[PDB]
Amino acid sequence: KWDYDLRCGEYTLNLNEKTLIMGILNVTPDSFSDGGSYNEVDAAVRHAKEMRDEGAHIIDIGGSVEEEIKRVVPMIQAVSKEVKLPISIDTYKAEVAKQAIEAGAHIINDIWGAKAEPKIAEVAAHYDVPIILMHNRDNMNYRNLMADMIADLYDSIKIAKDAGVRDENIILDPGIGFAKTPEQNLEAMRNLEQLNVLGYPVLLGTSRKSFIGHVLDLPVEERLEGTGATVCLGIEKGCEFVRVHDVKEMSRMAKMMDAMIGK
Amino acid sequence: KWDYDLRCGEYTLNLNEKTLIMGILNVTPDSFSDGGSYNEVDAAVRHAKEMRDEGAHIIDIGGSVEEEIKRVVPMIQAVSKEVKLPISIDTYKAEVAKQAIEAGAHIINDIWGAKAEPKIAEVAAHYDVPIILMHNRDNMNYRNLMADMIADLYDSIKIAKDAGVRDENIILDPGIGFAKTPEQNLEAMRNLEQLNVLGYPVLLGTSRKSFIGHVLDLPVEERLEGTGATVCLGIEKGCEFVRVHDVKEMSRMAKMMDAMIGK
Numbered sequence: 001k002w003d004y005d006l007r008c009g010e011y012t013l014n015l016n017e018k019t020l021i022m023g024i025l026n027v028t029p030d031s032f033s034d035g036g037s038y039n040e041v042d043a044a045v046r047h048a049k050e051m052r053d054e055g056a057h058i059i060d061i062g063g064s065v066e067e068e069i070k071r072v073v074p075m076i077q078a079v080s081k082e083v084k085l086p087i088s089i090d091t092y093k094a095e096v097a098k099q100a101i102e103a104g105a106h107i108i109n110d111i112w113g114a115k116a117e118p119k120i121a122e123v124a125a126h127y128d129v130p131i132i133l134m135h136n137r138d139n140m141n142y143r144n145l146m147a148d149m150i151a152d153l154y155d156s157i158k159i160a161k162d163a164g165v166r167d168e169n170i171i172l173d174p175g176i177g178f179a180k181t182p183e184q185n186l187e188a189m190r191n192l193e194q195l196n197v198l199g200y201p202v203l204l205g206t207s208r209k210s211f212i213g214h215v216l217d218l219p220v221e222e223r224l225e226g227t228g229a230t231v232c233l234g235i236e237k238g239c240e241f242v243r244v245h246d247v248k249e250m251s252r253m254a255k256m257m258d259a260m261i262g263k
Numbered sequence: 264k265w266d267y268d269l270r271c272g273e274y275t276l277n278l279n280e281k282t283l284i285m286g287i288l289n290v291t292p293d294s295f296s297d298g299g300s301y302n303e304v305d306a307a308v309r310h311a312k313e314m315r316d317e318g319a320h321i322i323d324i325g326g327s328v329e330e331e332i333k334r335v336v337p338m339i340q341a342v343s344k345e346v347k348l349p350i351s352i353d354t355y356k357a358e359v360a361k362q363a364i365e366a367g368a369h370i371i372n373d374i375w376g377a378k379a380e381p382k383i384a385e386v387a388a389h390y391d392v393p394i395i396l397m398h399n400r401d402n403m404n405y406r407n408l409m410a411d412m413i414a415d416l417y418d419s420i421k422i423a424k425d426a427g428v429r430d431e432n433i434i435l436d437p438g439i440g441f442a443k444t445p446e447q448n449l450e451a452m453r454n455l456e457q458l459n460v461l462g463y464p465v466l467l468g469t470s471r472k473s474f475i476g477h478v479l480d481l482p483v484e485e486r487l488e489g490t491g492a493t494v495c496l497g498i499e500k501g502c503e504f505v506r507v508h509d510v511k512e513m514s515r516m517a518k519m520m521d522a523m524i525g526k
């Protein structure tokens with residue numbers, strides 16, 4: 001089904017053999033620090049190593065602009081040195097993205113899908129890295145949620161391609177939890193397979209999100225079973241990646257899903 | 264979609280509003296006992312109460328023939344008195360089934376789908392209780408797994424209907440883990456929605472099963488995440504019931520699944 005691999009500088013991710021697990025990295029800043037402190041970088045590296053050991057395939061690291069660079073750059077440097085897995089930088093700023101790849105990051109993760117700072121697509125085209133274009137918007141007025149999300153995502157693909165991003169470095173995301181009501185999130189979940197017609201790999205980010213809380217009536221740290229349900233549903237509907245906190249568990253559910261669906 | 268309710272003497276189960284959770288009851292026999300001892304019946308009732316509290320909708324209780332009655336009858340009596348949920352008796356013997364309904368059981372659960380002791384269908388027709396007809400057989404020679412399972416299940420429906428069982432008291436089960444190789448179990452999982460053409464509610468029993476172990480390479484008590492995956496996949500493919508050990512967790516995944524699929 002995918003006739004290519006995700007090329008990430010030194011690592012390659014096969015899109016066909018398994019669902020890929022992107023581990024969300026814990027970034028508790030040191031009060032008194034600008035970024036760089038031993039306690040924060042060390043907790044970061046230990047956390048990344050643990051996620052590596054539990055089955056993560058990518059480490060996702062996130063961090064005003066000059067400040068964000070100071071915080072996140074030391075962490076990319078430490079983690080990429082010490083953990084042999086691709087890193088995605090979770091930013092929507094072209095400057096931070098530039099810096100982060102410079103510092104060692106392999107993939108851009110833009111929660112604004114190149115709409116906040118279109119220049120980030122150029123950053124991306126230039127370093128030749130995968131970019132994740134998440135569905136987002138500044139309002140919730142949908143004529144038809146799914147059709148609009150697809151229009152919107154498609155507007156991001158336009159910006160990316162126009163700045164020179166190759167199709168093989170585009171990954172899309174429904175942006176669950178963004179610019180959507182709780183019932184809209186469930187509906188996007190129900191209809192996720194429609195994103196496939198666009199022809200790109202899809203990443204799902206639902207981990208611990210509020211709509212799970214809304215359904216189960218359970219606080220943030222009681223949402224492991226409902227995150228699991230969203231991951232399973234997402235894999236059944238053809239997503240290639242899941243972005244999760246609870247790597248050990250989700251990574252087991254993914255692998256069981258993969259065996260059943262024949263991935 | 265279902266234009267009836269499951270009628271279970273004093274309780275009614277709606278097939279449309281949620282996936283129904285059948286709790287597997289722990290039956291550690293008292294050495295020195297025939298059946299009836301305080302320790303075993305009490306651990307049984309406490310376990311049933313706990314499962315009731317975690318979201319179970321049915322308690323499934325299972326227990327040579329005169330011995331099986333002695334063991335299981337005291338437990339049905341205690342649990343039905345003390346826990347206000349339907350009970351299914353897990354047996355394939357017409358005599359045990361008779362006794363168990365007499366003792367208080369509401370539903371028959373036959374892992375042989377009325378083929379071991381066809382008389383059980385008559386027991387069922389007579390007391391007017393739901394009967395679960397599980398796919399099983401004494402060999403694994405499949406021309407075409409799915410088509411054969413459906414033939415086989417259909418042979419059980421014949422035996423049930425011929426003994427006077429009304430359509431509304433038939434529930435079917437793929438019998439995952441029975442008479443199937445590990446790859447056959449995954450294939451039945453992959454194709455579960457085909458059982459729907461038969462027109463009956465479907466119950467899935469995959470909890471902690473060996474094929475999950477085979478996939479994840481994890482022992483019996485490390486299979487919660489992979490059980491979860493099978494439950495989610497089963498709900499997505501239209502099952503009405505799941506038979507599970509880990510009621511608290513599975514019951515949360517079910518409920519999240521239900522909200523996403525719009526049940």
Ligand SMILES: C[C@@H](C(=O)O)c1nn(C)c2nc(N)[nH]c(=O)c2c1=O
Nearest residue numbers: 090109111132134173175176205206
């Ligand atoms: C808001 C935050 C969270 O984990 O709650 C979040 N952050 N980021 C960076 C994300 N990135 C991508 N691609 N998808 C996402 O769903 C997503 C998120 O949901």
Ligand SMILES: C[C@@H](C(=O)O)c1nn(C)c2nc(N)[nH]c(=O)c2c1=O
Nearest residue numbers: 353372374395397436438439468469
């Ligand atoms: C073998 C045992 C187990 O839990 O491992 C089992 N017992 N019973 C009574 C079952 N009944 C129905 N209906 N379905 C089942 O899948 C099933 C089972 O898998």
